Automatic annotation (TrEMBL), chains A, B, C, D:
Entries under PANTHER family matching the protein: BINDING ROSSMANN FOLD OXIDOREDUCTASE, PUTATIVE (AFU_ORTHOLOGUE AFUA_2G10240)-RELATED, NAD(P)-BINDING ROSSMANN-FOLD SUPERFAMILY PROTEIN-RELATED
Residues spanning the membrane: none
Domain GFO/IDH/MocA-like oxidoreductase: 135-256
UniProt KW tRNA-binding keyword: no
Gfo/Idh/MocA-like oxidoreductase N-terminal domain span: 6-121
Record GO terms (molecular function): nucleotide binding; oxidoreductase activity
SUPFAM superfamilies linked: Glyceraldehyde-3-phosphate dehydrogenase-like, C-terminal domain, NAD(P)-binding Rossmann-fold domains
Record family assignment: Belongs to the Gfo/Idh/MocA family.
Presence of the UniProt keyword Protease in the record: no
InterPro entries: Gfo/Idh/MocA-like_OxRdtase_N, GFO_IDH_MocA-like_dom, Myo_inos_IolG, NAD(P)-bd_dom_sf
GO cellular component: cytoplasm
Designated gene of the protein: iolG2
Protein name: Inositol dehydrogenase
Amino acid sequence: MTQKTIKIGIVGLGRLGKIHATNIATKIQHAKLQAATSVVPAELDWAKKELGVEEVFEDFDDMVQHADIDAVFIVSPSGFHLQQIESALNAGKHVFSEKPIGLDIEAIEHTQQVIAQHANLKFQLGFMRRFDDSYRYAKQLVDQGKIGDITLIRSYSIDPAAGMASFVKFSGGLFLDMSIHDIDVIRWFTGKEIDKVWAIGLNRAYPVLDKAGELETGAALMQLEDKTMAILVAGRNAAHGYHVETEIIGTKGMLRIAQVPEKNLVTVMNEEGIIRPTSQNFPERFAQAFLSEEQAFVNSILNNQDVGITAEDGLQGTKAALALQEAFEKNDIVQVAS
Amino acid sequence: MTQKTIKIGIVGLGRLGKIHATNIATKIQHAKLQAATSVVPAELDWAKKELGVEEVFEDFDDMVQHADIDAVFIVSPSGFHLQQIESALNAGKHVFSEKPIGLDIEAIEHTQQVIAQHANLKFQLGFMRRFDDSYRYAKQLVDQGKIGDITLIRSYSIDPAAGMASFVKFSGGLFLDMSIHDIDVIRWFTGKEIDKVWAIGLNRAYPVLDKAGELETGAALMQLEDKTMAILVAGRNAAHGYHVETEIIGTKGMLRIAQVPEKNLVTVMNEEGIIRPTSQNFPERFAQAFLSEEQAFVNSILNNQDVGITAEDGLQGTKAALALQEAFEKNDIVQVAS
Amino acid sequence: MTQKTIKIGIVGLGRLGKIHATNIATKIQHAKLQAATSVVPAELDWAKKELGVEEVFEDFDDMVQHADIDAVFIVSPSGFHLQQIESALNAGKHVFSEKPIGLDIEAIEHTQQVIAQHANLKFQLGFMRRFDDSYRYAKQLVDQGKIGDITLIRSYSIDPAAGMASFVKFSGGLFLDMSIHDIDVIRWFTGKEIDKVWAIGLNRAYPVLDKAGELETGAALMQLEDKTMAILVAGRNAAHGYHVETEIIGTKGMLRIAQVPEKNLVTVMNEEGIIRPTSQNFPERFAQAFLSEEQAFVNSILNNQDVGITAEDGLQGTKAALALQEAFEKNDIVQVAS
Amino acid sequence: MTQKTIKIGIVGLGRLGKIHATNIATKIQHAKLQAATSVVPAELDWAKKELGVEEVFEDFDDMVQHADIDAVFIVSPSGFHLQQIESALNAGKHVFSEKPIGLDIEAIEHTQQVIAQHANLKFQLGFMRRFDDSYRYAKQLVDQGKIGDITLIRSYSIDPAAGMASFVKFSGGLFLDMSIHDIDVIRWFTGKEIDKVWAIGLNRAYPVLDKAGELETGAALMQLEDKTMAILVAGRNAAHGYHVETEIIGTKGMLRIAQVPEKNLVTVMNEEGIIRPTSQNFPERFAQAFLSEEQAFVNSILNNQDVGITAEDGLQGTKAALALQEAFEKNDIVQVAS
């Protein structure tokens, strides 16, 4: 029978890792979750009991050398992405990596070289908004010329207040954590790069974040290479739920993706007025996008086609995020290319 | 100087009467509130102090015979409308009357005759939705042919729950009280008459209304002369505010007027979700429409033009409402013309 | 390994049949599409090529007697449902049947008996709205007591105008075709039965439907056993897309499910105003619900649990729809139990 | 009789001047439009014919010295505001002035001194958003503590594309023209001043604006004195109508004023999807606010109360706008106080 089953090994079984693992094991066509790596025991036992994973490992290199797998999903903390990407490729495995690709520009370029030396292997970064139905619908309108050339993009990513308490005592920075997907969306929609940025921020609700070098809310203005404008807001304290919204203003029109984060098709009317319930967290909002990107990765290997999300999209995402962080600490305009 | 000041006398200084009186005295161009009639003393003192009305009367005929007025606003209880309309016309005064025109078909036809014998005097019924900006905008689309021929109209009029307690111990019927404006809207938009109706109702939240021969919620289905369909819902127990909504389905499109009763342009987002505050009562929702119909009445006299709301619109409104009430009591289909 | 793979045979490979078949073959866990029955050759070849179905049949009884299947999906025209349900159960197969269960009350009761004689086999009717995320969310609010007791339900099912031309030359009636899901929704939310109904209708846009004994738009008012009110509208000519909307008015609140049929989270702003794109047809709107009901059927067999959609829900749906049709032809109130 | 009629003279009978003049003459209580000044003949003839203005003048000082007026409305081009304000106050007239107060900081401080020397005369600047029902409703929520302390304000003012052609051949700058009301809104809601700003802009749709030192779209990021953040967008090319929107993010919630610029309560559904018509221009959107601010000015004189909009609100508005313009030309962060 034609085009068989891709056996996948996963590393990282935190919240996001468990989503990918569960999806691969139960919902994704032509895929099997064969192996898992974690150095937390309870996580490996979860993988065996809940998902019936056959091979467990305490060490990533041990998994890639010995497990019966064709591909890996890297969902470890960001500091490990580059070394795990390189090892997997060197052992002849296809690679899906969560964002960001890495944290250090020099180290990222070393990985770009390794990736280029394995052109026969698929490499995909987890920019899942590119697979979200609403984002894709908007991209289609833009590609068809329906709003003309893009003059301004505004994107907000604000985590729910429900997670603030855990964060306070729980980073890498606000823009690195929260805005990388927004940076990618800007590049994806425009085809252009970010030139210079200024970013400001505030810890009003939780001033303890000041001493921790963290931010609860930040905003940025960005000028792109052709003088295109972009506005970012990132935050960790949205009272109404998970607020991810992207606005595109063009010469012929305007559109918004999730102007408000509608949960479903239910409207409630009571003494409080007219109420639309909201989506509450990222797994709820982006459930479909996660499944679609996972399936796209599996199909890319089976059909030997490139998905079009490159190490370069990863590098630029990290670079712009670093530039935003630097602009915030200096409180001055920073050029991204520097 | 050209086209002077219309002096107006008012009878009825309940909630609605006070709105008209205040508007005429302070906001309406080319009008003066000259006289007021009421047999509640406190009301006449209010009219003198608050509005500086010059002539007060305890008797309507006394006012129309002796006051220095050109026109009257009849805002008395519905049982008095016909006799006050006739008296005012016989004394040579222009007449604005609140709905309904009257309660008894035979008595209404007697008044139609009196009105016909005074063709040089203006007569206007208070169907204020015809002057509401949103209703007028929809009428314009319909007249321009933008939704084609009308196949179905659904109209809801539901008073806020906040008034239920006072109503319980406080009628004429639900459809007479609440649906007359909806009946007029149906006739206004279509140009057609209502043929047969069935109406049902329920006193779920306040079953004490059963013994009082009143209804807290009722619904009706109506077939118009050309087989056009209409649906009515009337109620006294809306939790979210004052719900007045009209939906028109046509062969080429559909529109809704106040799908939800938005208060203003403010959206609130908090832990409850996305909230739109609502309008709470009729004076808030129809403030503009009241002012516009009052000004139209005054201008109709000054410019000697007919506004186009006739005693016949009044008769048919009362007739259809009676038919709905009869259908409800019999629990059977009733033909309106009978 | 525990709880294996349910092999399914399908009959009916029209539009809806192909959706179920594709889903079962590619997306549903623990299921295999093993066999297909059709007497259109092209359909069987589609099933073999596209879905790799192993066993094809020209005759339903041949499939149920000889194919290697544990369960059947009946997606044939409604006139065949009862005889295929009985045959499948008699051959020891679990049964999913699309709506309606059947068309003749007497014949339906015969099938109810056969079903009762096979209590160890699962039987499920395709009322997919019970599995839709938005309907389930509303049901949850209702069950939690959040809108109090239900006083009125309004449900609209209107097919897109895009299908009118094919329908004209293409029935069973409007209420049978379009309103069965609405009838089920009413029963599901309330727990109550429908007592008496009146239905009217019109063929304004396409009067050729008059001679065919069909309806393009119809409306109905229904009184339930406890004097609960329900309003239905069914149609085949919605200009804006596929309009399926359910409104529930309670003593403490109100909710609407898909007040407007939003396609996604994209809002467009151009010279036409503010635009929300709409879902266009049933497969788009109810994609999730179809997958969920299919998975629920498969899991019900594996876990030996009843889903709770019975032959009785089927009987009552057909009965009320027949009553609506009779009320329309007589233009009079009809009691459902008669 | 108590508290008489305020006689008003107006200068400036362009689009905005005609709105104020018409309102004062026909709608405003206790006011009379007595005199008009213009050096365009047709404008004075309009004032006499259309509004029955008694005294016309070609020279502003001639009007203030000789006309029978108690107060003046200054609706001349911005370059004349300061000299006309001073002259009116010196001749003992109450003053309403449109924004901006003036263009030159030094000249503005000279006028502040003149204003201080006439403390017995009312002075009011035309920041009409402070009188808009939706803005006032939001201010009320903020004052009541309902969204906590304000962390970010985003305000957009975008003129309709319908006016671009006339503008191209038709300035003072984009931020001066379009963003002064937004600056005032920020100060009004927060009580805080703007510290530093960066502004960027683009002439994508109409690059001819480059040579004219004008902007079609601009964006700005602002840091306020307590590290509060603000985002501005100003433009002249909105395809969907007049887009004025203000978003306030607080520690406990978020609100938007006119997230989309809804025209009325009508929703249209046709082949294009679900459509909300939009307001098209400033006179339509802010009709109510203009009437309210005019009435407030008249009442302030009659009741000898201060409205609370000062020359200082004017100075700071102009200062911040100049800072935004300077930041744009330098493409660098500018401190407002410098």
